Design a protein around this nucleic acid. Sequence first.
RNA 1: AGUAUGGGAGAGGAUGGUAGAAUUCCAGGUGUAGCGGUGAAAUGCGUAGAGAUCUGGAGGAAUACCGAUGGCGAAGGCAGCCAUCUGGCCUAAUACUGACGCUGAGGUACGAAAGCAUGGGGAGCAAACAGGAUUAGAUACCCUGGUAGUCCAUGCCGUAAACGAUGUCUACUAGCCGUUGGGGCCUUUGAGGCUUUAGUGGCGCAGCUAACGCGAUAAGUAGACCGCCUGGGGAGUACGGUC
Lengths: 52, 117, 63, 104, 88
Amino acid sequence: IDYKDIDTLKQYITENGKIVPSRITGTKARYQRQLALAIKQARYLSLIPYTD
Amino acid sequence: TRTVSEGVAHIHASFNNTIVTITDRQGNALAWATSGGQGFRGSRKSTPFAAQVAAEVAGKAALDYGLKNLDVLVKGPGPGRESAVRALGAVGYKINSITDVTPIPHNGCRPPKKRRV
Amino acid sequence: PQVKLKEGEPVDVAIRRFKRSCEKAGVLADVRKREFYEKPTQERKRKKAAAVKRYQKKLARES
Amino acid sequence: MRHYEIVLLVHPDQSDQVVGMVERYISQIKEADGQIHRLEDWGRRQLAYPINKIHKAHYILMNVECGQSTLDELEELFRYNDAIIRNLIIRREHAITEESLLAK
Amino acid sequence: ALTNADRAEIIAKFARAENDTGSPEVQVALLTAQINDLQGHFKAHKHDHHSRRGLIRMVNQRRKLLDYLNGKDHERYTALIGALGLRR
RNA sequence: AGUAUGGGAGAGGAUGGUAGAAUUCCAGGUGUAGCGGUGAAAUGCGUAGAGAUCUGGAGGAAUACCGAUGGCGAAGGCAGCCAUCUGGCCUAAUACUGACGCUGAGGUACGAAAGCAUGGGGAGCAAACAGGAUUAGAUACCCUGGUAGUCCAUGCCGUAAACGAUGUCUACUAGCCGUUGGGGCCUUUGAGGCUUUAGUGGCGCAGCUAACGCGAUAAGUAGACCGCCUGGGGAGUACGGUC
Ligand SMILES: [Mg+2]
Ligand SMILES: [Mg+2]
Ligand SMILES: [Mg+2]
Ligand SMILES: [Mg+2]
Ligand SMILES: [Mg+2]
Ligand SMILES: [Mg+2]
Ligand SMILES: [Mg+2]
Ligand SMILES: [Mg+2]
């Protein structure tokens, strides 16, 4: 999971842009942490929105 | 004098009062009403009825500009947020969309202290 | 939310759908949370209680 | 020398000057010593949110191997280059040469 | 941060036998090298108390090893301190 | 007990930069009567135009979601993103030293918040203080404002229900169910099932306990060293000394 895989990043983002919890999505701890980091990087680089 | 076909409606709903301001696009104001201003000046300002009356009067006032379709943005908590859109529909505006715009700080400023009542 | 409305959508049903979308979003609880500042010790105690309740719920379901 | 990945956003009006700036940056790495493993130009893209009232920007990504000097020199070039609007530098272990998604 | 080549050179200089990496001479030489290296860092960061604890641990371990070597054989201890330039 | 070499996870520490949301204030546009607050009110703000909405600007402080009897650190404690310097921990095999170890009176290092000295900064919150309410009285709880402080640099201060109310180290003593970081083995439908190790949780046999309860993370069975207590008040007080 990288910051350049916008499709898989979107698959774990709600309509409002918030990050879905692991308990709901079904992922593991390491993947969840890596993917949160990737989402933050993409938000900074403006590939994905912060909100809305 | 001015004639506009489409506009926006802003509902500032709080725990003590509800303000309904109908503006044009780009945010220039056209009409505004308040639950407390439209009578019901007491603890009843926060009741849904006052919000409905405010929305009705605001819509009737704004009808002079020939607005038929409205977009609704609702801000914050408080009873009467739902009543405003119902009153707008009753007075006859066609609601294109309804959206929520309540601000959410990302752990910014420190809020006030807890009340001990 | 951005609940776009169909041509024949009634206002009441539209408002019901908007309320459902807002409930799913959870903005109201976030707004409530920031009304008063809560101290870190109280927050930690609340989270501990929540975790204790959650584990008991899981065990009860498994039983 | 360590491995670095650099992503740059460029103002659209200076999109024609991107070739010169990338060429100069590459020449600096090569003359210092360095090793340039990847260089991709994603092209114009609409931003998720406006930055400085700009709604579209040109994206350029590059993977290089260099030293601390070459580095701080490149960061100060990006600092003082007006065309560059936002940059991200991530350290990496070992070099990546495979074509990346969003290439074109 | 000392490198693998530097550590290997130190071990080659102070090795008493082939594949000897656990002798007091080699251990004390490596500890002395790393202690000297960290001094540069600790002027640039006077308030890195968390790392200063590891530095103090290194110093204590070097002292224990030197005491053991001195107790078991004086000539080796004197030669080691002379080569490493340490007071005691 | 320690050392060399390959991998792994982490809000561990220090210095610099940077990004988004929000509050406050300042100008401009639309626009005209309330806004705000409580149990109800009132003080306060507004027709030299408030509140509401839109555009632009200034500055400070903290980093939503992820987030989790999750993680790391000797303790205190550590949360956005990126770079630089840097400590510890886990994990496989081989190869080295050969008891090099445990504890620790004095001593010494670190040590939340508040407070202190110098210089800077100050959005929001807020001791003190002022006003409006409640009450028989209100020096309070409630409401409207609001200073020190909370922030930064360099030092001092040595304190907390600084708590697991449980000093450190070592060996042994039924089982069952979670979860975090690794090692190994077996199936296939690409994710599962068994083991072992180091952490972190829920039950529970024996044993222990005045009882409550603890129970391989012991308060069980044994060893080594240290600190501490001897009815309740006077009292962590006076005198003397040190800082
Ligand atoms: Mg209040
Ligand atoms: Mg000791
Ligand atoms: Mg007050
Ligand atoms: Mg500092
Ligand atoms: Mg004490
Ligand atoms: Mg504590
Ligand atoms: Mg005690
Ligand atoms: Mg005293």
